[PDB]
Design a protein around this ligand. Structure first.
Ligand code: CHL
Ligand SMILES: CCCCCCCCCCCCCCCCCC(=O)OC[C@H](CO[C@@H]1O[C@H](CO[C@H]2O[C@H](CO)[C@H](O)[C@H](O)[C@H]2O)[C@H](O)[C@H](O)[C@H]1O)OC(=O)CCCCCCCCCCCCCCCCC
Ligand code: CLA
Ligand code: CLA
Ligand code: CLA
Ligand code: CLA
Ligand code: CLA
Ligand code: CLA
Ligand code: CLA
Ligand SMILES: CC1=C(/C=C/C(C)=C/C=C\C(C)=C\C=C\C=C(C)\C=C\C=C(C)\C=C\C2=C(C)CCCC2(C)C)C(C)(C)CCC1
Ligand code: SF4
Ligand SMILES: [Ca+2]
Lengths: 37, 144, 126, 733, 80, 198
């Protein structure tokens, strides 16, 4: 059927908008400032 | 001629202070120290802003970059006809003499200087970038 | 060399700055983080409570404001953790706060103190 | 110390300022400038990047299909595609208040949704999609294809799977396979889908994977194809009373060339499109056997290029050595590909609005306007990129020793003549077009509209008459009933084509007048000026009188300093930079003309455009001021409606454009001094100096500033026009 | 660091050395001109890339060229 | 030394010094030596928490008490506001004492007791058994939550329903059937992908 639940946007929109970008920005920020050995 | 040695116990010109002085780079990376001899007390302009008074005799000053030291050197040489010299000081205490490197100013030719970065050809004789492509990194045809 | 003025050279302001937890230089970084977090969460709970989108509805304005302040404290804790990870990577006395372990403990203490301050500010309005 | 990022540049990794991050982000795809890069490694990285790009494209398509199948109204739109607006996807935003929630709740949905303007509903309906299950299956299939392409990209980088440099240079084999397989076989397969699924689904017969092996596309079943009686496939086509999606008025033919449009859907016949794809499939497959690969027969492109020099020496050496300078230069190939793709994108826009291929597409005014504007802007950007890569080829891959006396060297030999003539054409067009406009404006302002200069476009009207339009009265070729060209097509395709071209209610060869003449000259001015900037930057890329050794500094460099009078914006990158503004201006003029002519057409008053397009005041008042009333009223102190998002986007684009003007006008130095003062302020502030930066704050470089300003300018330009066009077309209709 | 190069068309006028604001160039003995001097760049690590030396060069074309290379604290002229 | 599939190879940083090593690190997150110890401690505490949670959930379904996903909504003989305050107050001191144990010793501990073992059966084999059981319990808890997400009811009820018709009652015949089937096929192809390149 592939139909997502009714609560799917209420969970995926906040995820993709705040949780995933925060994790991506934190990991990318740590990677950019990492010093080479 | 011999390379001079920095004297940390050298009087500095009369200056009330400013906000354009040294920053954290002087305490963590490096700074520069310029010294000169003045025949009399005279008011000069600081490269960082303001007017200071150089005293009769030795004068020592600190700057954040080499350009400030050379600007002060140019001002002292062209106006008061003095002969200043500067060094690069590291936080560990190492002192490196910078200008005039061989004791003679670079505008006048001096014996013993070995030419560096001199191409024995003209600009029009430079090869095309295709012959320099796929090198170790971004290289210009003038570098070869 | 530098410019000295009575604002930056008064002994009263120097003593006030030295009395702050950030300039203690000798206490545990986690305690410093707890103190700073409490002092920040208590003031942070105010704007979300009195100006948020649910500021007019009763019995839920304080709830929404406290939850928003808690989320902000969590974001600030994550910012402190990533700052410590990207700032201390290699190499008076040296303050232990400016170190990888010191800053990590400071960020954890800030998180605990901030959440406690938010929770205390919520019950203080009841 | 040395940072890890960027791993491809050791010089950038040693940069202690914030410029390291920006330059690492902007030089990530410049593989030729990476450390320790070889030719084989370069081609392998491009291969992997190509696979990743295909994966992204397929995932995006699957996402659109999934969202239309989940939150759309495709099952209801197919029943009434004239009075039902398509739905893009649902809206879930906690910032929406109650009025915004009921304002965006439209189209028959149970919540706030977005009305799609991409036209995928009409396209999917025409190709055979009817239910949400079909879109769901297509979305899953495209997601699997995307995952397969991503895995292929990862696999072609591992050992025992990396292609050699010789494999990437097999031009004959690649061209043969792209012409016969990627083009011909794909077109043949599309013909199979149209004949097997689209055509029977348009006649009310469901043909899916569960019954396509037991349903005949034609009642004669492959017998006329093998016996050569191909005309049997064109017998009994769809009549003029056929209802799309039902069997009422449907025929039995599968390959026709009736021409014109369907009387109900106002789109091209499905049988005609199937026949078109079959013919081009045969042509492309045949063309795929031209080059010699491994069987002795075929051609060698080097031989054809070397054997194409005029005997009198007008072209010098001709095309000698052109095979090596193209096969060994990726920028030359990229420039050729972008030039052809940009021209084809423009062709797609023109043919798609004039000859709508999808059912019920002409009635959707917002879809037509958005599609035309989208493809024209994409084409303009691609054209600018083609010329930019041509300049990059001249600097990085051009070798005068290998290209000695051929056409490529002769272009640079007389580059001054080309630039001067482009300058003369642009100057003439600009002076005269602006003069005629200002003259008409003064005549309209003084109350004497009969004194304005209105030159009739007799040449384009003559061409329109040659195509069959009898409005002008030339009466020749297809317009004359006694011509050989007219009588030779009266039994195959001329009836439908003539009926469609003589109809003034469609977009097939619209009636033109003096306003069309003037705006066409404005378009010519834009094209010539953009070409002048791009061509001049590509020809002067290797050097000029001001900078004789410009090729030694690369394609993009800030300047050569204030010496020799000043050398600001002297690189070829700066030429492309200045040309992007002209491209945006040209596409703005073409889209403004298209939107105004179609708005007056759809409103039923073409006389408004015919009488107000001859002066610029009519363009500013009757087109920009008049059509933006509903747009700016999306949200006002009395409330808001569903059009408030376009008003917000309108102001958003204006803000981005104005923000771009900052990076465009103010330059580095001022900002660097200001940043130094900020550095001092942070270092001397208690309770804040305990937190220090890892990268030294510096102002953006000159090249970076230009790029950032142009990006903001383009983003604001695009968003502003998109919001205005969609809001005006949707609100009016 | 930036790349500073001297070419054989130099006439030894010493104008580029006097115009350098960070003491990057100098004069060395030579025999290819009447002045018997030639410009040199032995301290390119301190070059900022202001191109004042190119502005001060009177030969056509220039005898001294500055190609902007890698950026560091010294090349960017940062006092912080 | 068995690996995570028949024929794997350690990624040069999982030689086998750590207990329960199988050379499983495709994302290479344990490339740093300092991060390997912290990740190991995190794995051990996550496993212990999952072990206790799984045993608690399995015990609640046998007696007949409310479901694990609805036990919070039940009204107890306390206030939820006071429960959260006490929970974070006790755990602050408990986690602070546990963190100081890892910095001095390197393993877990309770309060001021770093090697917490009143009985004394702290052996090398017992440490690996804890890790294996913790990993199994982590997967079991994920299975509990996933089964309650699509089927609801309960873990014991799910096992009882699977015995009624094993060929017709499974994850493939549920609402997440095609996704898990495609994922299983991709996973089965994965060892061949790694072995083909190497
Ligand atoms: C530490 C892990 C932990 C986890 C994984 C959960 C998980 C859950 N709790 Mg829960 N809780 C947890 C700790 C705690 N809870 C509660 C008190 C409650 C309550 C009062 C309720 C839940 C409920 C729920 C469920 C739905 C919550 C939700 O967002 O619904 C989406 C909306 C569920 C997923 C709810 C529930 O069971 O609903 C049927 C519920 O009513 N929890 C306390 C006491 C302070 C906890 C810890 O101290
Ligand atoms: C959706 C997909 C995209 C998503 C984007 C998402 C987020 C945004 C991401 C990033 C934002 C921008 C970040 C980079 C800003 C510019 C920084 C920069 O370094 O900028 C400078 C870069 C780098 O230049 C390189 O700089 C190099 C610097 O080398 C120096 O340093 C080197 C390393 O040490 C060597 O030492 C070398 O010798 C030395 O000279 C060389 O000079 C190279 O020749 C030179 O090419 O230049 C360049 O511009 C390179 C970029 C080329 C762009 C070309 C297209 C321009 C299009 C404009 C119009 C846009 C319209 C958008 C429309 C939208 C509608 C909705
Ligand atoms: C490129 C295609 C594409 C695009 C542009 C969108 C866009 C959107 N989706 Mg969607 N989605 C897609 C594909 C896409 N989706 C596919 C293929 C699926 C099937 C698995 C889904 C399943 C899905 C659900 C269930 C929901 C959305 C929702 C949404 C909306 C909220 C924002 C969001 O991202 O939620 C999250 C989107 C996802 C979690 C799907 C991403 C899954 C793919 C496989 C990963 C893509 C990785 C990406 C390409 C990498 C680049 C990102 C970054 C690192 C640069 C938004 C309009 C929500 C909504 O409807 O709001 C009303 C919502 O509930 N999407
Ligand atoms: C793209 C994703 C996204 C999402 C999902 C949200 C979601 C939300 N925003 Mg936000 N916002 C975003 C992007 C987003 N925003 C961006 C890009 C900007 C900058 C332009 C803003 C600027 C903005 C402002 C200025 C405000 C919001 C507010 C809100 C909240 C609405 C208040 C409400 O009516 O509910 C009710 C609110 C509650 C019941 C309280 C919930 C408190 C938080 C959300 C829960 C606990 C936090 C969580 C545990 C930790 C999350 C951190 C995570 C990243 C690790 C809501 C939860 C308002 C707000 O914060 O409310 C005070 C508000 O003032 N947003
Ligand atoms: C019959 C065999 C065959 C086939 C099918 C392909 C197919 C492909 N090759 Mg390949 N190749 C082959 C043989 C083949 N190759 C051989 C033998 C060699 C060795 C000599 C190569 C070497 C090679 C290289 C080096 C590369 C490719 C690449 C590609 C991909 C190009 C991506 C693309 O542009 O999209 C598809 C293009 C089309 C479908 C044609 C579009 C026609 C016009 C432009 C559009 C008009 C159509 C219509 C109007 C629009 C549709 C409307 C609506 C649906 C929206 C593509 C999938 C590139 C790649 O790797 O990508 C991963 C690439 O770098 N190939
Ligand atoms: C098949 C298409 C294609 C391909 C493969 C390339 C490939 C390449 N180009 Mg090219 N180009 C193209 C088309 C293409 N281009 C087009 C269409 C244009 C016109 C716009 C250009 C104009 C162009 C120029 C002027 C230059 C290149 C350069 C390059 C080379 C490396 C630069 C790079 O990509 O780094 C990475 C690229 C970026 C990081 C781009 C920055 C982000 C842009 C500005 C998008 C911003 C959009 C914005 C975020 C939208 C937000 C809106 C929303 C938030 C509201 C590379 C080989 C450069 C070069 O050769 O080096 C000397 C060079 O200077 N290109
Ligand atoms: C409305 C703004 C505007 C205007 C009028 C122009 C006009 C022109 N641009 Mg230009 N351009 C613009 C914006 C503009 N640009 C912007 C924003 C950019 C991006 C930075 C560019 C970048 C650009 C480039 C890179 C190039 C041009 C070129 C040209 C010239 C093209 C030749 C032509 O069309 O002849 C017609 C002449 C005109 C339209 C000028 C107006 C004539 C006036 C109105 C008549 C005199 C008035 C009256 C008799 C006397 C009044 C004076 C008073 C003080 C007494 C032309 C002068 C190209 C060029 O130089 O071609 C050779 C060139 O290469 N432009
Ligand atoms: C509309 C375009 C535009 C904008 C937005 C700005 C903005 C700014 N200019 Mg500027 N300027 C412009 C045009 C513009 N300028 C042009 C065309 C020129 C050329 C003449 C200049 C020349 C110029 C100079 C010479 C100077 C400035 C300065 C400044 C800064 C002043 C500080 C301030 O206003 O505080 C606040 C910032 C704003 C009001 C900008 C809008 C910010 C929005 C409202 C906030 C949105 C936040 C949101 C939550 C972000 C979330 C995003 C999400 C994706 C996460 C400011 C950022 C001065 C400066 O350096 O600062 C002291 C300065 O000296 N400008
Ligand atoms: C660390 C793992 C863990 C966690 C988080 C919980 C959590 C919970 N248990 Mg539980 N329990 C556990 C392990 C755990 N248990 C184990 C290992 C056993 C077997 C000895 C039990 C046996 C058990 C019983 C018999 C009951 C609970 C109950 C409860 C709930 C109320 C708390 C209470 O009042 O008593 C703490 C609560 C949500 C009570 C409940 O509400 O029933 C659902 C209930 O009566 N648990
Ligand atoms: C710089 C450079 C370059 C170049 C580029 C380009 C070249 C661009 C452009 C351009 C373009 C974009 C073009 C196009 C074109 C077109 C054409 C040339 C055409 C045509 C036509 C015809 C021939 C037609 C005919 C007809 C008609 C009239 C109608 C009907 C049909 C028919 C067919 C009959 C490169 C990269 C290479 C490299 C080097 C450098
Ligand atoms: S300015 Fe030019 S000619 Fe004069 S010394 Fe310097 S390099 Fe030689
Ligand atoms: Ca069907």
């Amino acid at each position: 059927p592939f139909v997502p639940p009714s609560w799917a946007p209420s969970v995926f929109v906040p995820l993709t908008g705040l949780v995933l970008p925060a994790i991506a920005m934190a990991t990318l920020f740590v990677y950019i400032e990492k010093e080479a050995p | 001629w011999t390379v001079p040695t920095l004297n940390p116990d050298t009087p500095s010109p009369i200056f009330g202070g400013s906000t354009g002085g040294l920053l954290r780079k002087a305490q963590t990376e490096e700074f520069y120290v310029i010294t000169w001899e003045a025949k009399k007390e005279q008011i000069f302009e600081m490269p960082t802003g303001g007017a200071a008074i150089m005293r009769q005799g030795p004068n020592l000053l600190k700057f954040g970059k080499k350009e400030q030291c050379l600007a002060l050197t140019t001002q002292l040489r062209n106006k008061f006809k003095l002969t200043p010299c500067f060094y690069r000081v590291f936080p560990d205490g190492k002192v490196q003499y910078l200008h005039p490197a061989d004791g003679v100013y670079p505008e006048k030719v001096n014996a013993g200087r070995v030419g560096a970065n001199q191409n024995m050809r003209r600009i029009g004789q430079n090869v095309n970038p295709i012959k320099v492509k796929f090198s170790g990194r971004m290289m210009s045809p003038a570098e070869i | 060399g530098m410019l000295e003025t009575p604002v930056t050279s008064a002994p009263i302001v120097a003593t006030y700055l030295s009395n702050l937890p950030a300039y203690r230089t000798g206490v545990a970084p986690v305690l410093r983080g707890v103190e700073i977090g409490l002092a920040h969460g208590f003031l942070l709970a105010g704007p979300f409570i009195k100006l948020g989108p649910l500021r007019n509805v009763p019995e839920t304005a304080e709830i929404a404001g406290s939850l928003s302040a808690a989320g902000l404290v969590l974001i600030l804790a994550l910012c402190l953790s990533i700052y410590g990870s990207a700032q201390f990577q290699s190499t008076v006395a040296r303050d232990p706060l400016f170190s990888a372990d010191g800053w990590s403990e400071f960020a954890a203490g800030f998180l605990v103190g901030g959440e406690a301050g938010v929770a205390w500010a919520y019950v203080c309005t009841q | 110390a040395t940072k890890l990022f960027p791993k491809f540049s050791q010089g950038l990794a040693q940069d202690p300022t914030t410029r390291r991050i920006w330059y690492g982000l902007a030089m990530a795809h410049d593989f030729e400038s990476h450390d320790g890069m070889t030719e084989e490694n370069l081609y392998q990285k491009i291969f992997a990047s190509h696979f990743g790009q295909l994966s992204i494209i397929f995932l995006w398509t699957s996402g659109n299909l999934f969202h239309v199948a989940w939150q759309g109204n495709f099952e209801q739109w197919v029943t009434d595609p004239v009075h039902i607006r398509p739905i893009a996807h649902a809206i879930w935003d906690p910032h929406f208040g109650q009025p915004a929630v009921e304002a965006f709740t439209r189209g028959g949905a149970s919540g706030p949704v977005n009305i799609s303007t991409s036209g995928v509903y009409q396209w999917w309906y025409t190709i055979g999609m009817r239910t949400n299950q079909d879109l769901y299956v297509g979305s899953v299939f495209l997601a699997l294809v995307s995952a397969i392409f991503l895995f292929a990209g990862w696999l072609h980088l591992q050992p025992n799977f990396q292609p050699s440099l010789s494999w990437f240079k097999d031009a004959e084999s690649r061209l043969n396979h792209h012409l016969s397989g990627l083009f011909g076989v794909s077109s043949l397969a599309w013909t199979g889908h149209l004949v097997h699924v689209a055509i029977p689904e348009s006649r009310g017969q469901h043909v899916g994977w569960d019954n396509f092996l037991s349903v005949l596309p034609h009642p004669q079943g492959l017998t006329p194809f093998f016996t050569g009686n191909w005309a049997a496939y064109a017998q009994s086509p769809d009549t003029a009373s056929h209802v799309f999606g039902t069997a009422q008025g449907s025929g039995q033919a599968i390959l026709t060339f009736l021409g014109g449009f369907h009387p109900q859907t106002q789109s091209l016949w499905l049988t005609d499109m199937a026949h078109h794809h079959l013919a081009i499939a045969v042509i492309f497959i045949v063309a795929g056997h031209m080059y010699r690969t491994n069987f002795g027969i075929g051609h060698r492109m080097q031989a054809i290029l070397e054997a194409h020099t005029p005997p009198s020496g007008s072209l010098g050496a001709g095309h000698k050595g052109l095979f090596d300078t193209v096969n060994n230069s990726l920028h030359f190939q990229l420039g050729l590909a972008l030039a052809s793709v940009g021209t084809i994108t423009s062709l797609v826009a023109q043919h798609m609005y004039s000859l709508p291929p999808y059912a019920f597409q002409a009635i959707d005014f917002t879809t037509q306007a958005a599609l035309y504007t989208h493809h024209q802007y994409i084409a303009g950007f691609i054209m600018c990129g083609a010329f930019a890569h041509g300049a990059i080829f001249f600097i990085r891959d051009y070798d005068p020793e290998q290209n000695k006396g051929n056409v490529l060297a002769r272009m640079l030999d007389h580059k001054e003549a080309l630039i001067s003539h482009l300058s003369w054409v642009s100057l003439f067009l600009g002076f005269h077009t602006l003069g005629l406009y200002v003259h008409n404006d003064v005549m309209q302002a003084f109350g004497t509209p009969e004194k304005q200069i209105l030159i009739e476009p007799v040449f384009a009207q003559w061409i329109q008459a040659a195509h069959g339009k009898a409005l002008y009265g030339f009466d020749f070729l297809l317009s004359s009933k006694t011509s050989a060209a007219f009588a030779n097509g009266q039994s195959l395709w001329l009836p439908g084509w003539l009926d469609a071209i003589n109809n003034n209610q469609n977009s097939l060869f619209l009636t033109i007048g003096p306003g069309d003449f003037l705006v066409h000259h404005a378009i010519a001015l834009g094209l010539h000026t953009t070409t002048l900037i791009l061509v001049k930057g590509a020809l002067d890329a290797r050097g000029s009188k001001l900078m004789p050794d410009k090729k030694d500094f690369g394609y993009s460099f800030p300047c050569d300093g204030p010496g020799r009078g000043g050398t600001c914006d002297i690189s070829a990158y700066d030429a492309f930079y200045l040309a992007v503004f002209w491209m945006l201006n040209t596409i703005g003029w073409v889209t403004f003309y298209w939107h105004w002519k179609h708005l007056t057409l759809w409103q039923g008053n073409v006389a408004q455009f015919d009488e107000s397009s001859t002066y610029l005041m009519g363009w500013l008042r009757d087109y920009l001021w008049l059509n933006s009333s509903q747009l700016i009223n999306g949200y006002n102190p009395f409330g808001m409606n569903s059009l408030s998002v376009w008003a917000w986007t309108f102001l958003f684009g204006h803000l981005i454009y104005a923000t771009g003007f900052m990076f465009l006008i103010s330059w580095r130095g001022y900002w660097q001094e200001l940043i130094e003062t900020l550095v001092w302020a942070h270092e001397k502030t208690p309770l804040a100096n305990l937190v220090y930066w890892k990268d030294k704050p510096v102002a953006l470089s000159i090249v970076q500033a230009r790029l950032v300003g142009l990006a903001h300018f383009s983003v604001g330009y695009i968003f502003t026009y998109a919001a205005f066009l969609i809001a005006s077309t949707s609100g009016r209709f | 660091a930036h790349i500073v190069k001297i070419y054989d068309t130099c006439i030894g006028c010493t104008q580029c050395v006097r115009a350098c604001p960070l003491d990057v160039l100098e004069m060395v003995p030579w025999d290819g001109c009447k002045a018997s001097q030639m410009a040199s760049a032995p301290r390119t690590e301190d070059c900022v890339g202001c191109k004042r030396c190119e502005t001060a060069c009177p030969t056509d074309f220039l005898s001294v060229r500055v190609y902007l290379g890698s950026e560091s604290t010294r090349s960017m002229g940062l006092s912080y | 030394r068995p690996m995570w599939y028949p024929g794997a190879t350690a990624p040069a940083h999982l030689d086998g010094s750590m207990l329960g090593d199988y050379g499983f690190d495709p994302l290479r997150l344990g490339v740093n030596k300092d991060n390997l110890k912290w990740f190991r401690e995190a794995e051990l505490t996550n496993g212990r928490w999952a072990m206790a949670a799984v045993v608690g959930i399995l015990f609640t379904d046998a007696v007949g008490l409310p479901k694990f996903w609805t036990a919070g909504a039940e009204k107890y003989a306390l206030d939820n506001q006071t429960l959260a305050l006490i929970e974070v107050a006790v755990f602050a001191v408990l986690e602070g004492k546990r963190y100081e144990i890892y910095k001095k010793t390197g393993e877990t501990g309770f309060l001021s007791f770093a090697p917490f073992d009143p009985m004394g059966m702290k052996s090398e084999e017992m440490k690996l058994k804890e890790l294996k059981n913790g990993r199994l319990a982590m997967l079991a808890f994920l299975g509990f939550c996933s089964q309650a997400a699509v089927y609801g009811k309960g873990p014991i009820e799910t096992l009882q329903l699977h015995l009624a018709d094993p060929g017709h009652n499974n994850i493939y015949t549920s609402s997440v059937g095609p996704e898990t089937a495609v994922t299983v096929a991709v996973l089965c192809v994965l060892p061949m992908i790694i072995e083909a390149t190497k």
